[PDB]
PDB file of C-alpha atoms (C1' of nucleotides) in Angstrom:
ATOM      1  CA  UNK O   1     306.151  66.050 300.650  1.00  0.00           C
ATOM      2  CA  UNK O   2     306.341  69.498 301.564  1.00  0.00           C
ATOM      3  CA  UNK O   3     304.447  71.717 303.323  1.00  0.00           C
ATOM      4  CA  UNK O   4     303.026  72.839 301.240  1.00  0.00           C
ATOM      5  CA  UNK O   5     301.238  69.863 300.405  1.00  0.00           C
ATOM      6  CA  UNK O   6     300.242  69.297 304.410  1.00  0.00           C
ATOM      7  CA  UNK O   7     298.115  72.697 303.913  1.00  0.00           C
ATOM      8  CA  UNK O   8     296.071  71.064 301.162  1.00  0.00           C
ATOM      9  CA  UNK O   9     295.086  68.819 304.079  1.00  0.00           C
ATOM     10  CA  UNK O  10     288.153  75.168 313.400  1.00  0.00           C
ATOM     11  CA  UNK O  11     291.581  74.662 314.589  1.00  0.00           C
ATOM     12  CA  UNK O  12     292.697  74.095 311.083  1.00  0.00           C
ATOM     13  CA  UNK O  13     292.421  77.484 310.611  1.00  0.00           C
ATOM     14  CA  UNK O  14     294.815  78.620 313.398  1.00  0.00           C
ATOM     15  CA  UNK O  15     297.212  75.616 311.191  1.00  0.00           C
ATOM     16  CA  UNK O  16     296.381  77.624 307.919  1.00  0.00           C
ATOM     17  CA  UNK O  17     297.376  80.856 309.132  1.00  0.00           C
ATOM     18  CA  UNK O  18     300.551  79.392 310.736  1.00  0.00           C
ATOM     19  CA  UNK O  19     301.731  78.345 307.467  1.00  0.00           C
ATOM     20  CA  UNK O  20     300.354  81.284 305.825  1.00  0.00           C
ATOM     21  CA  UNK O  21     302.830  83.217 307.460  1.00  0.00           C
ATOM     22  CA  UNK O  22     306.027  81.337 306.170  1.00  0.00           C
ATOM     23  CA  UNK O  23     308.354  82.092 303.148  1.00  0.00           C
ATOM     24  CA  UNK O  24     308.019  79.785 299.873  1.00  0.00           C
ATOM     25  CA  UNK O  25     311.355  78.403 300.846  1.00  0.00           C
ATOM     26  CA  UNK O  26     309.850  77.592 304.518  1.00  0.00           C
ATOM     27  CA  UNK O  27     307.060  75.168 303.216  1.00  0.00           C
ATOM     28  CA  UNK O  28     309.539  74.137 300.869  1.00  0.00           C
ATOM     29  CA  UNK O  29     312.317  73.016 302.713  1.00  0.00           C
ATOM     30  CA  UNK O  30     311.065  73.259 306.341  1.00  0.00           C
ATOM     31  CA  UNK O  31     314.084  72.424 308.021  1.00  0.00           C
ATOM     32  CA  UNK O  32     315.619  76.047 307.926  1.00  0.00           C
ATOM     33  CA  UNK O  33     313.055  77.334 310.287  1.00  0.00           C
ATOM     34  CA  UNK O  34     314.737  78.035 313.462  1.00  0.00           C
ATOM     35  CA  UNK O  35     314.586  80.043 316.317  1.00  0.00           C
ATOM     36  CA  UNK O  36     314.148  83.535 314.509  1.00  0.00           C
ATOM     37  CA  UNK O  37     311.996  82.044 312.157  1.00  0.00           C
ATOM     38  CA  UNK O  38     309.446  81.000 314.481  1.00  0.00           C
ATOM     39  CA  UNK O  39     309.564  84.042 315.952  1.00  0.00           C
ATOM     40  CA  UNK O  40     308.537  85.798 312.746  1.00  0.00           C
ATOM     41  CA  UNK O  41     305.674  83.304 311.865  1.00  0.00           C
ATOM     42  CA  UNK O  42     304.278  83.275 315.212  1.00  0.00           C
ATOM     43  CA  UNK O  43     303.718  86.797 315.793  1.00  0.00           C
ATOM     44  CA  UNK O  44     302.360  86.725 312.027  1.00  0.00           C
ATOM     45  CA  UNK O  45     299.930  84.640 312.629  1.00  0.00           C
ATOM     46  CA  UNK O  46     298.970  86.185 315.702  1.00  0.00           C
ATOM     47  CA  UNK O  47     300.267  82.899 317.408  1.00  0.00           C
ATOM     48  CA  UNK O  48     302.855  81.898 319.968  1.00  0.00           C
ATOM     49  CA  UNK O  49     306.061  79.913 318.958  1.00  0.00           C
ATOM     50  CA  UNK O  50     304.776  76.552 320.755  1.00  0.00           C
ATOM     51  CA  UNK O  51     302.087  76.581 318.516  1.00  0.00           C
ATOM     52  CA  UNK O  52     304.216  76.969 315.640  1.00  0.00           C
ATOM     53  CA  UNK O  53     306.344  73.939 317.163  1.00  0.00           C
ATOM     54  CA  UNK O  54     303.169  72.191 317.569  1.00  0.00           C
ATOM     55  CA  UNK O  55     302.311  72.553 313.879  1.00  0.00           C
ATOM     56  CA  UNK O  56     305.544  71.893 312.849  1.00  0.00           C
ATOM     57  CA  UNK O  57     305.847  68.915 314.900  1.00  0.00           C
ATOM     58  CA  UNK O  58     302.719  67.610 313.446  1.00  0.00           C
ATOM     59  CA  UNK O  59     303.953  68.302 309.447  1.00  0.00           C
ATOM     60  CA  UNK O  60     306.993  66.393 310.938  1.00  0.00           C
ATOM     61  CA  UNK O  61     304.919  63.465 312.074  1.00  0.00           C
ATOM     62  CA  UNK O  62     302.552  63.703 309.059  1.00  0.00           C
ATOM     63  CA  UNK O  63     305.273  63.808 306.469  1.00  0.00           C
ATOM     64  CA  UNK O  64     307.307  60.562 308.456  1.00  0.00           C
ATOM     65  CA  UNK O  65     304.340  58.637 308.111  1.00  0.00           C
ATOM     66  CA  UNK O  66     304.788  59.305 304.191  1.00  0.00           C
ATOM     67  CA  UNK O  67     308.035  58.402 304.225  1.00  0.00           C
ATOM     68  CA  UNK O  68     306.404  54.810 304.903  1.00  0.00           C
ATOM     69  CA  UNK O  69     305.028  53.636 301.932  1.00  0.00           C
TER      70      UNK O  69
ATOM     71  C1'   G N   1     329.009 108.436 291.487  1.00  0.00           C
ATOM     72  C1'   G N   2     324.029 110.435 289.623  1.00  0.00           C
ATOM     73  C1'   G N   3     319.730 109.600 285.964  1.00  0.00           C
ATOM     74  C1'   G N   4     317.187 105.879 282.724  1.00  0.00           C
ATOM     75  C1'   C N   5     316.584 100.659 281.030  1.00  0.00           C
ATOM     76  C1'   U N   6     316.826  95.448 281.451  1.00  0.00           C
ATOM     77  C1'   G N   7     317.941  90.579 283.829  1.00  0.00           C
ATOM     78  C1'   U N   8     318.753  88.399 288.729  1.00  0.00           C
ATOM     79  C1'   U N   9     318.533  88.461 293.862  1.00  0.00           C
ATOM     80  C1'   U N  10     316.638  89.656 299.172  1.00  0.00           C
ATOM     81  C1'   A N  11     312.603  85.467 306.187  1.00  0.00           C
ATOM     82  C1'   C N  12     312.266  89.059 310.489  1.00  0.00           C
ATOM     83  C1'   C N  13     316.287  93.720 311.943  1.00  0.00           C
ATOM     84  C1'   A N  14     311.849 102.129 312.351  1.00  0.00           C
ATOM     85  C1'   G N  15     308.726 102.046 303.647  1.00  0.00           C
ATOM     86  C1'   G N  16     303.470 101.088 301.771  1.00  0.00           C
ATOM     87  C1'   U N  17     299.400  97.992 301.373  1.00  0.00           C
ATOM     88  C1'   C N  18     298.068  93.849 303.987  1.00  0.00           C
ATOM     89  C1'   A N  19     294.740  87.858 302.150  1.00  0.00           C
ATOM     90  C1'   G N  20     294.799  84.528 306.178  1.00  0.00           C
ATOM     91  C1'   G N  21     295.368  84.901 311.546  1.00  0.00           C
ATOM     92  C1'   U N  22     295.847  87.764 316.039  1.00  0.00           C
ATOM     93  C1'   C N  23     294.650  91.960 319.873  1.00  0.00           C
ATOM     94  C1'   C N  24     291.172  95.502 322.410  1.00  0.00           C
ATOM     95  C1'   G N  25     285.753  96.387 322.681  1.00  0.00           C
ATOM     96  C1'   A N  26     278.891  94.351 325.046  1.00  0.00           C
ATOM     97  C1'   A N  27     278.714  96.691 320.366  1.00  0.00           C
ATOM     98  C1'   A N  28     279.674 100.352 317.032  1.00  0.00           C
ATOM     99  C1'   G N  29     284.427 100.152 316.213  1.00  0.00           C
ATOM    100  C1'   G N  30     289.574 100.773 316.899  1.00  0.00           C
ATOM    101  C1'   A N  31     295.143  98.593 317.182  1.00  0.00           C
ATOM    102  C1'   A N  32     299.592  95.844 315.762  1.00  0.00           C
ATOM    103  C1'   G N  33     300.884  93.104 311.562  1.00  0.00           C
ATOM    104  C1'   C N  34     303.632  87.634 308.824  1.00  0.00           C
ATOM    105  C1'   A N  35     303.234  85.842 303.716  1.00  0.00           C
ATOM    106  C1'   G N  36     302.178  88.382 299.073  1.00  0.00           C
ATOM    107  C1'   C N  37     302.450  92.192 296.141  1.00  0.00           C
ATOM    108  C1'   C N  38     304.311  97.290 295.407  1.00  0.00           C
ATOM    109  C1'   A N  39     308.520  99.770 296.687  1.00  0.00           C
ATOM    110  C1'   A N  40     313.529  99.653 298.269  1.00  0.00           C
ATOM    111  C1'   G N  41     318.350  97.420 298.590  1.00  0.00           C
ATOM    112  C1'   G N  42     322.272  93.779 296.526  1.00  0.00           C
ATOM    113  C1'   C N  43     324.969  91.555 291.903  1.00  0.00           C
ATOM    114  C1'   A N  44     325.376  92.566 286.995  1.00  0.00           C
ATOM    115  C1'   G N  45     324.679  94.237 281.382  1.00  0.00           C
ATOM    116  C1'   C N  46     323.202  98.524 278.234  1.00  0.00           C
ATOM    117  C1'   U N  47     322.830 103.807 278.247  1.00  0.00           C
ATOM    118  C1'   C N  48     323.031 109.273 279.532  1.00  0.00           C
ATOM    119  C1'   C N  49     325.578 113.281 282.649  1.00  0.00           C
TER     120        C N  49
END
RNA sequence: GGGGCUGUUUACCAGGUCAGGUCCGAAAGGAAGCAGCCAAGGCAGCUCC
């Protein structure tokens, strides 16, 4: 579970464009995305970084819950 | 080394375009710009000077 599975899935559209910003190895393997990263996706998406950490936190929570069943 | 070809590779770090999203504006409209793609660079093979 990926993320980009989690995009399949009004403020969805601010989540969209988050991950539209990212690299096919950042949905891929989310775990690289540090600092820098962030950086680059926020301002891409015409976010901030906590709302990248937001998102991120919630693919986090989203994809734990998968790895429950 | 330079030209051409082909395969591979490259988040952001003054190329271009820019979906999605953002910014400014009452509006009409402007602005910046990730991914992508194009380009460009890297690692190589062929080839020409």
């Amino acid at each position: 579970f990926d993320l980009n599975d989690f995009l399949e899935q009004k403020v969805l559209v601010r989540m969209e464009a988050i991950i539209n910003s990212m690299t096919m190895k950042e949905r891929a393997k989310p775990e690289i995305i540090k600092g820098s990263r962030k950086r680059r996706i926020a301002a891409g998406s015409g976010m901030q970084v906590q709302d990248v950490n937001r998102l991120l936190k919630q693919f986090d929570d989203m994809q734990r819950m998968m790895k429950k069943m």
